Amino acid sequence: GHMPAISLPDDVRRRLKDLERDSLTEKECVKEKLNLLHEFLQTEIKNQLCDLETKLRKEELSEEGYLAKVKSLLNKDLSLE
């Protein structure tokens, strides 16, 4: 990025703050975070996630593996800017 200037909308961000009060959860965070970020993340991102689901279905990946792997990817995508 020569000069990036894209970041989550202020209206969206406010919703997360309200959610924080309602007390989210690890599993709940991924479901909400995925759909929200998706609105700004291309489907090619969801595609990467789809392959992981296959591992969950073949019992090759740990439950916490997907939960912990998913988080990092979300942050990595935003770090690109």
Side-chain angles (χ1 to χ4, degrees):
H2 181 253
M3 275 187 150
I6 300 169
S7 49
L8 280 172
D10 274 333
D11 275 338
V12 181
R13 289 177 177 268
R14 288 179 180 195
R15 293 177 66 186
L16 282 71
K17 298 292 181 180
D18 276 340
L19 288 176
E20 185 178 14
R21 182 184 290 180
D22 290 342
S23 339
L24 294 172
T25 322
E26 291 176 357
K27 293 180 184 291
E28 292 176 4
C29 277
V30 181
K31 290 180 184 292
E32 289 174 0
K33 186 175 181 179
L34 282 167
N35 278 238
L36 267 72
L37 292 171
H38 180 65
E39 186 175 343
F40 283 86
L41 296 177
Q42 300 186 295
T43 308
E44 293 177 4
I45 307 304
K46 200 172 275 193
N47 283 343
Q48 308 303 327
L49 293 170
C50 293
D51 274 335
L52 292 169
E53 184 177 341
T54 312
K55 293 179 175 65
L56 295 174
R57 184 176 177 87
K58 294 180 179 179
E59 195 175 15
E60 299 295 351
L61 180 69
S62 280
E63 291 178 8
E64 295 176 5
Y66 192 92
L67 292 174
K69 286 287 182 180
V70 166
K71 205 174 180 180
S72 200
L73 174 70
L74 300 177
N75 284 340
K76 288 178 181 287
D77 275 338
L78 272 299
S79 203
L80 204 163
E81 291 174 357

